Amino acid sequence: VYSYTEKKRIRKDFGKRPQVLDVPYLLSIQLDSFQKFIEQDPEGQYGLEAAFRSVFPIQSYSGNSELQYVSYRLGEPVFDVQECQIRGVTYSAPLRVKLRLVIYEREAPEGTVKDIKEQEVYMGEIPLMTDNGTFVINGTERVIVSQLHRSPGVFFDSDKGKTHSSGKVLYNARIIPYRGSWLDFEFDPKDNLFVRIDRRRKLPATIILRALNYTTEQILDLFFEKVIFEIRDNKLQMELVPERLRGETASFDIEANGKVYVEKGRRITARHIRQLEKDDVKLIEVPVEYIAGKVVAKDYIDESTGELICAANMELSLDLLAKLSQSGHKRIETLFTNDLDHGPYISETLRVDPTNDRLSALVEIYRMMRPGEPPTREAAESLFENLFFSEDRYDLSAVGRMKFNRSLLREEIEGSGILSKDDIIDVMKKLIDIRNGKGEVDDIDHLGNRRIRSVGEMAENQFRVGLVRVERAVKERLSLGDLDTLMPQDMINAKPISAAVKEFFGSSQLSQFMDQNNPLSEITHKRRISALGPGGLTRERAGFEVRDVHPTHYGRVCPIETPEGPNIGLINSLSVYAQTNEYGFLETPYRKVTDGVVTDEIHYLSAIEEGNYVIAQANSNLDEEGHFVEDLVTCRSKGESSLFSRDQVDYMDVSTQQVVSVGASLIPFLEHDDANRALMGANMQRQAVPTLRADKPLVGTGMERAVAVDSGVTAVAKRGGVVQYVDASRIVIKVNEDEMYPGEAGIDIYNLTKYTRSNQNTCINQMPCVSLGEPVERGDVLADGPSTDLGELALGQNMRVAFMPWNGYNFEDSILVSERVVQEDRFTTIHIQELACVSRDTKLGPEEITADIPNVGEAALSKLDESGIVYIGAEVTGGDILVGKVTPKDSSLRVPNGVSGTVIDVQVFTRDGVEKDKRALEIEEMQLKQAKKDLSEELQILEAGLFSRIRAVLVAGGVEAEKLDKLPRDRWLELGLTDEEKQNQLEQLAEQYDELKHEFEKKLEAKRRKITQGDDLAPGVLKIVKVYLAVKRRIQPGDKMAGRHGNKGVISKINPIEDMPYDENGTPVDIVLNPLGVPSRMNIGQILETHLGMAAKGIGDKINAMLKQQQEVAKLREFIQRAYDLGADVRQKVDLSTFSDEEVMRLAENLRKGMPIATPVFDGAKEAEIKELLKLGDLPTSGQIRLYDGRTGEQFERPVTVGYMYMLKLNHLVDDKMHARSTGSYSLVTQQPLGGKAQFGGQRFGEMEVWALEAYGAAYTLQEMLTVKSDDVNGRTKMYKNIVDGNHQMEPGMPESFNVLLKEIRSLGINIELED
């Protein structure tokens, strides 16, 4: 079965692999994140409710007052999205919060509160998100690109051989909280652990432990094993477990029970270790020199006197052991230090640090954190308590805690937000184990370590930042002594929250300005993943490794689509199927593999879990049962790919196109061209200005329909039915009964947006693609947006292309276009400009917009009306006056030079309180009549639909064939019905419609007031006049035109039609490319694309010949069936027998100018299939035709490739690039401003150009460029006066920039003098 929109034009689809999972919603990330942020979400987790609940409980310093919130709600936006866009106001919704205030009795908080206050409060405006995923902030659509950053947690960086030149690795550990201070642990070259808080100066690591009220003995116990030694009568026998010493040489002779098992000076292997373990002789005797090496662990005090024989971390010695012998202590503690296994890292740090008590560590911490201030015990205690264990100053999010526990190999997933002493100790122990060789470092680029932060999370963080200061202000206000003085409304201020949200949404590194030249550009901009922004890398700081593509990018981030240039790799687009995890990481679907069978259920795997399993490749033969016939199916294990047995595999790729982005997947034959050219082609599709008429690609990937419908450009029917009324402005759909709601059933009206300026100054219009009475269902496209054709993304046009050199006009990348391309206007693009005029309130009287302009000709005023505004539809040109704008004393807004287009409409905004000029009256009365007409038309159409649905109720025995006709026109809902209770229902519905039209007229009055009310304006201007010019561009030499496989070029010459090469039948080729562009930059996709395009157009021409002359439907139908059944093993399987024999005619009509072909990115048509398709038509299999020269008339040798290629016109126009200047304005430094074409700037003669000028030995040219054309004002005027008199002299003079520099240096107390 096929949809009705599919019936009219169904694209032939190659591709053997049957897709299991369809492409998800393209913009799911933005919508899902914002819906999570702002919605009624109880229990906390993440959302606005969680942010409200985290902070709002108020503790007052003896204020006795508690303030807490009950609930929050969102008010209806004052204006609709279109109204906000037109007015230039933010599309936001008020945030209403029900706050409660309770104060207890004095010296009595135990009982009920003496006063309980509850009052809804207004907190601020939250900019709501449009349906498509865009934000309207000041009448301009903006998008918030999701940010990618290091996930909160703990990482262990190698820092391998960067310093010390010795090749040693300085292992370090880092803790990154979501909000707090960084904590670092570092290894010095001397094997000493150092701690750095917030990237301050180094500090001994054991200072933190001492600051954690940890005894030195406790530290030794935690970070070191204890070797028990005892004082005995017989040689003072040592205790030594055999398992402790493994794989080390023994200096002493090892005798157990008298018999020697391991001799002195010999290492111990496994057999002696096992022998000793079996013996289990823990006691041993060593020479008195052996004990001297060890270091004591615990404090030992003489029982006789109480003095300290040896404190902790003190090396043992002969006198020390003698004193212990006099002490008679039966237990001697020595730290188990083994150079190969362990390390005395902690012991040396305790040896180095000067602190010996908690207070010493605390004052050292205070000194390091806040230098200069004197050390205070209580202040230091508070500072350390608030650094890492206070909820407000420090917090690890749930994702951060999960990552921390997972890195520390703990089973618990969720824990406290703040750190703990055990956590720090475990981090340091893990770092020590890393140093000893037990464990591995973590790579930063791993996609398990990076996180996705969308608009919802960043908006929530900004809201929290705004809320904390309001909370502080409320706490400060509550400190004042008051009781029931005021409501909990004047206490809070909406300004901090409003500013904190508006600044983020309007002025941020990630609140990017949307580009709307294509539906594809709109889709891609919402799918971007930018590593920059707040809390992220910068272009300069980003290293070489970050820009590289990691092995874990497979299926998560596109390896192809990324901007070439400064930020290469820092910005990249999310892949097709990749959807963010609930924690924040990136996931990709995978087909589960049972025992030898590939199943249907799909598991989304994150980055970490993907490593363990063995995942098969997408391109492997399944044969509709599983059991890959080859027993060496290629699979990619952890970070590597190798062959595996068919049973070893555990997962499968869902589809071939799950690696590339949406933008890069539009390219056909993506697997046949180099990655560089694919990157260029993916980046160039986003800059294709929409053409005058959309033309579907003859050969495409096949997902263009999905990206067209999933954007907001096309109008898609939400409820199916029949098209009651269609028109170039709007479409009205009569909903089918089953989908039609019972209560107040009506018909939905689709209002199309006609020519409107986009962000890139291109036209946006909706074209109705449905006819009158044509049935539609839910989800079919009703109107085509910009650059879409029947619901398919039509970026450019497909034209005949020949690959041959032609008299050097296509030399390196130039393109020669036939004049036939210009003649039929198939590359013409509309451009809408916006010129604004403001009636500023300057001194000497306000500036007025009036018709009479002093000292100008009447011809200028002829175009203007009597009110000083330009007539709608006037063919203005550069310099023509658009508004009066007379200033007391002239300065009238006029069309800038080089602009020539009709003025489509004018919008006038007038300050509330001042008079309205006659054109303002005309505009407001026309808009009021238009609003009245719209309301009356919708009311009449809805009335007709409702009264027709009432007839259906009246049909059931309540009305006859003549009863309704004889009934008066006011009471069709009042008729004798059999049921006698559904009659009461009809009366209720009639009353509901009566009140509904009262509501409609009330909303009409509200709309009239909105038009009548003085719209808000910035202070200092009475009225704002906006004039929209609409210039129609045309192709010409110098324009940039590009294909899809990164083969950009510039138009060189518009060849006449007769000069172009022509084939045997006489059809000229539209464009000739250059063959030399293919072998060097390997993009064979275009050659295969042009062969397939020739095949498609051959099929189209065959059915056109079958249609130009009358042919029976059977012949045409069987030919179309043969064309659709061409593939050897394709999955399309269209049968024309199920068609209605009239829809076949419509399909043939839609196919007569081409046969669309779908070739997925990595499962496209093979060469043999293309040759077979060419043989289906009457075309050569080789794909090359013998062309005849247009002018000479002699046929070319070496048959030349000819075919149809999809070519785009890029936004890099030529009339917007060409510029020139002879004399204009100058700056304060008297150089020309070079605002470019904006203020008639002069091209800058840069520093690297004077080097070339003086390398030639050209002194006079350099002098004139430095002085006479730039800065010497006297030189400038003298040179200008000399030129017009026929003289070409030159007065050098002195540049003004040098004098400015002289004054600048003199301003610093440094004497500059041009001494003679």
Partner RNA sequence: UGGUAGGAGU
What's the min distance (Å) between Cβ of 1087 and RNA? 21
Closest CB 660 distance from another protein, rounded Å: 9
CB nearer to RNA: give 685 or 714: 685
Nearer to another protein, 595 or 1285 (CB): 1285
Of the pair 376, 642, the CB lying nearest another protein is at 642
Find which of DNA, RNA, another protein, none residue 509 binds, CB within 5 to 8 Å per kind.
RNA
Q: Kindly state the tokens that stand for 676.
A: 């560089």
Q: Let me know if 630 is exposed, middle or buried by CB neighbors in 10 A (0-12, 13-18, 19+).
A: exposed
User: Which one among 95, 103, 129, 137 touches DNA, defined by CB under 7 A?
Assistant: 137
In angstroms, the CA 406 to CA 245 distance is 32
The least distance separating DNA from the CB of residue 687, rounded to whole angstroms, comes to: 11
Report which of 340, 404, 419, 353 is spatially closest to residue 188, judged by C-alpha positions: 353
Pick from 845, 878, 1235, 1292: which binds DNA (CB under 7 A)? Answer: 1235
Q: Which does 1056 bind (CB under 5 to 8 A by kind): another protein, RNA, DNA, none?
A: none
- DSSP state for residue 980 in the 8-state scheme: S
997 binds another protein (CB under 8 A): no
Q: Which conformational region is residue 554 in: left (phi greater than 0), alpha (psi within -120 to 50 degrees), or beta? A: beta
Binding flags for another protein, 10-49, as an x/- string (CB under 8 A): ----------------------------------------
Q: Whole-number minimum distance, CB 445 to DNA, in Å?
A: 12
Please, what is the minimum distance in Å from the beta carbon of residue 1039 to RNA? 13
AA identity, residue 195: V
Could you say whether residue 513 binds DNA (CB under 7 A)? yes
1200 contact, one of DNA, another protein, RNA, none, CB 5-8 Å limit per kind: another protein
* Residue owning tokens 């237990």: 331
Report H helices in 199-250: 206-211, 216-223
> Does residue number 1293 form part of the binding site for DNA (CB under 7 A)?
no
Q: Which does 1182 bind (CB under 5 to 8 A by kind): RNA, DNA, another protein, none?
A: another protein
User: Which range binds another protein by CB under 8 A, 51-59, 302-310, 780-788, 1229-1237?
Assistant: 1229-1237
Instruction: Give the pair of three-digit tokens for residue 230.
Output: 């005892």
Q: Tell me if 1220 contacts DNA by CB under 7 A.
A: no
> If contact means CB under 5 to 8 A according to the sort of partner, which of DNA, another protein, RNA, none does residue 140 touch?
DNA
Could you tell me where the beta strands, DSSP code E, fall in 15-171? 65-74, 92-103, 115-127, 135-136, 141-144, 146-150, 153-157
Tokens read off for 1208: 């785009």
H/E stretch holding 653? strand 651-653
Tell me which long-range contacts 760-763 makes (C-beta under 8 A, separation of at least 24): 760/515, 760/516, 760/517, 760/689, 760/1211, 761/831, 761/832, 761/833, 761/834, 762/516, 762/517, 762/689, 762/690, 762/786, 762/829, 762/830, 762/831, 762/832, 763/690, 763/830, 763/831, 763/832, 763/1030
The reply on whether position 907 binds DNA by CB under 7 A is no
Binding flag, residue 1310, DNA (CB under 7 A): no
Residue of 377, 778, 1217, 1303 that binds DNA (CB under 7 A): 1217
Least Cα distance to 709 among 612, 640, 641, 783 occurs for 783
- The nearest distance, CB 495 to DNA, in angstroms, is 13
Q: Least CB distance from residue 1019 to DNA, whole Å?
A: 11
188 contact, one of RNA, DNA, another protein, none, CB 5-8 Å limit per kind = DNA
- How would you classify the pairing of strands 902-910 and 815-818? unpaired
- Cβ atoms within 10 Å of 11's Cβ, excluding its own: 20
**Footprint on residues 294-333 left by another protein (CB under 8 A):** none
Interacting positions 607-626 with another protein (CB under 8 A): 617-619
Question: Is residue 1026 classed as helix, strand or coil in its secondary structure?
Answer: strand
617 interface partner picked from RNA, another protein, DNA, none, CB below 5 to 8 A per type: another protein
For another protein, what does the binding mask look like between residues 1055 and 1094, x meaning CB under 8 A? -------------------xxxxxxx-x-x--xx--x---
- Parallel/antiparallel/unpaired status of strands 1049-1055 and 815-818: parallel
Contacts with DNA by CB under 7 A: the residue count is 32
Residue 1267 DSSP class? I
**Of residues 188-227, those binding DNA (CB under 7 A):** 188-189, 201-202
Q: Which is nearer to another protein, 1121 or 1297 (CB)?
A: 1297
Q: Is residue 830 involved in binding another protein (CB under 8 A)?
A: no
Binding mask 88-127 for DNA (x = CB under 7 A): ----------------------------------------
Smallest distance from the beta carbon of 887 to another protein, in angstroms?
Answer: 23
Q: Which does 679 bind (CB under 5 to 8 A by kind): RNA, another protein, DNA, none?
A: another protein
3-state secondary structure (DSSP) of residue 836: strand
User: In this structure, how many other beta carbons lie within 10 angstroms of the beta carbon of residue 925?
Assistant: 11
Bridge partner residues of 160 (DSSP): 169
User: Taking the CB of residue 915, how many other CB atoms lie within 10 A of it?
Assistant: 8
For residue 104, the partner it binds in another protein, RNA, DNA, none, with Cβ less than 5 to 8 A by kind, is none
Q: Is 843 in the site for DNA (CB under 7 A)?
A: no
CA dihedral 50, 51, 55, 57 (to 10 degrees): -50
Shortest CB 914 distance to RNA, Å: 25
For another protein, the closer CB: 153 or 1183:
1183
* Identified binder of another protein from the candidate list 33, 407, 562, 711, rule CB under 8 A: 562
Region near another protein per CB under 8 A, out of 39-47, 468-476, 692-700, 1193-1201: 1193-1201
Provide long-range contacts, Cβ within 8 A and 24+ apart, for 804-812.
Answer: 804/1061, 804/1072, 804/1075, 804/1187, 804/1196, 804/1200, 804/1201, 805/1074, 805/1075, 805/1076, 806/1061, 806/1072, 809/1052, 809/1053, 809/1055, 810/1049, 810/1052, 810/1072, 810/1073, 810/1074, 811/1052, 811/1074, 812/1074
Q: How far apart are CA 1242 and CA 1233, in angstroms?
A: 8
- Binding of another protein by 1250 (CB under 8 A): yes
916 binds another protein (CB under 8 A): no
Q: What are phi and psi of 1042, to 5 degrees?
A: -140, 150
User: Residue 495 is encoded by which pair of tokens?
Assistant: 């300004």
Q: Which residues bind RNA (CB under 7 A)?
A: 509, 512-513, 515, 530, 532, 539, 563-565, 567, 571, 683-684, 687, 1048, 1212, 1227, 1233, 1235, 1238-1239
Which string of x and - marks every residue 649-688 that binds another protein (by CB under 8 A)? ----x--x--x----------xxxxxxx--x---------
Instruction: Name which of DNA, RNA, another protein, none residue 1052 binds, using a CB cut-off of 5 to 8 Å depending on partner kind.
Output: another protein
CA distances from 1215 to 53, 900, 1037 (A): 57, 12, 10
Q: Is 1014 in the site for DNA (CB under 7 A)?
A: no
**For the packed helices 918-955 and 982-1012, what is the interaxial angle rounded to 10 degrees?**
170
Q: Distance of CA 469 to CAs 63, 472, 491, 842, Å?
A: 18, 5, 13, 39
- Name the amino acid, one letter, at 1316: D
Q: Are 1230 and 1299 contacting, i.e. CB atoms less than 8 angstroms apart?
A: no
Question: Angle at CA 556, nearest 5°, toward 552 and 557?
Answer: 95
What mask of x and - would describe binding to another protein in positions 1198 to 1217, judged by CB under 8 A? xxxx--------x-x-xx-x
Task: Give the one residue of 391, 744, 1249, 1254 binding DNA; rule: CB under 7 A.
Answer: 1249
Q: How far is the CB of 140 from RNA (least distance, A)?
A: 12
Contact 29, 579 (CB under 8 A): yes
User: Which residues bind to DNA, rule: CB under 7 A?
Assistant: 137-138, 140, 162-164, 188-189, 201-202, 506-507, 513, 540-541, 543, 759, 1216-1217, 1219, 1234-1238, 1241, 1243-1244, 1246-1249
